[PDB]
Amino acid sequence: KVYLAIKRRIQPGDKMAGRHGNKGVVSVIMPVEDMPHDANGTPVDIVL
Amino acid sequence: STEQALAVAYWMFEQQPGPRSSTAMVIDSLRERFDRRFIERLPSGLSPHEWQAQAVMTVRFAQRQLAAHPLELAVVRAEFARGRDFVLGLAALRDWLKPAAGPIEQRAALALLMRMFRRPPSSIREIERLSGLSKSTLHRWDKEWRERVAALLRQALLRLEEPMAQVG
């Protein structure tokens, strides 16, 4: 018997869910610029 | 093999059914895995639908390659392919070998070509009975047609041998 290792990168379609029963399927992965950014320049990662 | 490939393509076009997947015959072949001199080890070729599609691709490629010689393509269709393809090949062979043959003569020529193509009637006597022509004339026409068809088919096969190997 043999074993294999797979690095599953998260991609659109994968189901993501928080802790309060808030499920979700990742729709797209848009680049960092398109994310809404704070006046300080800090962008968010997730747009619920 | 090019000749084997052509034969298989014609056979798959004719026996298009593809057959139902078999049954506890599989168990026998599985009890042949054990058994011993079964010597029936599945060669593991292409899939049934895959093989049928392969035959179709081969037929299309042959039609494309032999397009420049309509008579050669018709002769190949008459010799190998069946159904409407065989009908078209026989019609073209009749129009070529016996262009101005009368309707009775055209029917006799079609019957002789069918007899050459292992199709009914299978006897020269039956051909004369259904046509009314002398046995000598029928024999002479058949001898000439067989030689002409063999030569044309050899020409087409020679033309395709390099193309078939280029297709594998």
Partner: protein
């Protein structure tokens, strides 16, 4: 049944007689013979539709229909071979019952 149906005006009996007439009329018009109801012979399913499949390691998996067929054939062979020697009547009727 047709003669008797109107003789009695009671509802239940006339209902039963109506059902009898319906069955008899269906049989007569259908050309069906009631004696065929109790079968003397029965058909067998074609093998492909009741296949047994073996698995890796010499395991075989057989359909239920195959087991049922084996059982009934076994019991029929039992009947014939005990019958030709005129088995005791209790034993023969018992075997008839298990075959049924």
């Amino acid at each position: 049944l047709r003669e008797e149906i109107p003789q009695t005006n009671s509802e239940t009996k006339i209902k039963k007689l109506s059902k009898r007439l319906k069955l008899m009329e269906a049989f007569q018009g259908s050309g069906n013979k009631p004696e065929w109801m109790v079968l003397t012979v029965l058909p067998v399913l074609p093998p492909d539709l009741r296949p047994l499949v073996p698995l890796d390691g010499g395991r075989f998996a057989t359909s239920d229909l195959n087991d049922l067929y084996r059982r009934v054939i076994n019991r029929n062979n039992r009947l014939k071979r005990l019958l030709d020697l005129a088995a005791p009547d209790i034993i023969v009727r018992n075997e008839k019952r298990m075959l049924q």
